Amino acid sequence: EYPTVSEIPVGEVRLYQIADGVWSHIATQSFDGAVYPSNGLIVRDGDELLLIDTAWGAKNTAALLAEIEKQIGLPVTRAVSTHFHDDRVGGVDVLRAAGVATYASPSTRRLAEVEGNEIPTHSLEGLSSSGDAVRFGPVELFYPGAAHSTDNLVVYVPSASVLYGGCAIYELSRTSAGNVADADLAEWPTSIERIQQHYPEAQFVIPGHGLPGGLDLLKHTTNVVKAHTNR
Numbered sequence: 001e002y003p004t005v006s007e008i009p010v011g012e013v014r015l016y017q018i019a020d021g022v023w024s025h026i027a028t029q030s031f032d033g034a035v036y037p038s039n040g041l042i043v044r045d046g047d048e049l050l051l052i053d054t055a056w057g058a059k060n061t062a063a064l065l066a067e068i069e070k071q072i073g074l075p076v077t078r079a080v081s082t083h084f085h086d087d088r089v090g091g092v093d094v095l096r097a098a099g100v101a102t103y104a105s106p107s108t109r110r111l112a113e114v115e116g117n118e119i120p121t122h123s124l125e126g127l128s129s130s131g132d133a134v135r136f137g138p139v140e141l142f143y144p145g146a147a148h149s150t151d152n153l154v155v156y157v158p159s160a161s162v163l164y165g166g167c168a169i170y171e172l173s174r175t176s177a178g179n180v181a182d183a184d185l186a187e188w189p190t191s192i193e194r195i196q197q198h199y200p201e202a203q204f205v206i207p208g209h210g211l212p213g214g215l216d217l218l219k220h221t222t223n224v225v226k227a228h229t230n231r
């Protein structure tokens, strides 16, 4: 039942329950003349919610907050953006105005400022070196090293065995690499290796765009990235 790009009008947000207390949020955006879906995560944090990533823009992120209230009804109190690009931080201003405490690593905040993108308020400590992991409410944040971007984080939900890869992990239907201008193509396979070694127990893997799957999505992503490097 996972919604695909043709099933979500731009401006609307859909939620998909992955496991007890874990949802993905799915939105769509026009970009480069195409339409792309984009995922983030919602994790129950007691009687509150932790949000992972915006819904790629102010309008989409307002729709995200509305859909969360309609379908879940717990307040979003904190949000983490997993790298500095607009599908992760675009809409941070909307979150901030709604009383959400927004977070990102120091590297993400700096890169967002350089790029002209919205800047999450709070700085996450302990994620500056490859292999670093820190617990943050009901998730673990992991910096695997540079991949899709130099700052990209992944998010593990231990209670539900859900690994959220953000844009460092590709869905299976994507067999070519795109929008890699800020990527470290050479390090990306090694960074995925670090993810597999650190979260071998993941049952579900959620890419930044497209359908969830299992841990196969990690090897798939390595295969596609390597093929692009060699092309």
Ligand SMILES: C[C@@H]1C([C@H](C(=O)O)[C@@H](C)O)=N[C@H](C(=O)O)[C@H]1SC1Cn2cnc[n+]2C1
Pocket: 031, 036, 085, 086, 087, 088, 148, 167, 174, 178, 179, 208, 209
């Ligand atoms: C423009 C998007 C976005 C940008 C970024 O973060 O680099 C920024 C706007 O936030 N992230 C994307 C990604 O690749 O992670 C792409 S969408 C991806 C491209 N594509 C080709 N076939 C299927 N897809 C999905």
Ligand SMILES: [Cl-]
Pocket: 084, 085, 086, 087, 115, 117
């Ligand atoms: Cl961007």
Ligand SMILES: [Cl-]
Pocket: 100, 101, 102, 121
């Ligand atoms: Cl705050």
Ligand SMILES: [Cl-]
Pocket: 101
């Ligand atoms: Cl706060």
Ligand SMILES: [Zn+2]
Pocket: 083, 085, 148, 149, 167
């Ligand atoms: Zn990106």
Ligand SMILES: [Zn+2]
Pocket: 101, 102, 121, 122
């Ligand atoms: Zn605060």
Ligand SMILES: [Zn+2]
Pocket: 087, 167, 208, 209
């Ligand atoms: Zn992306």
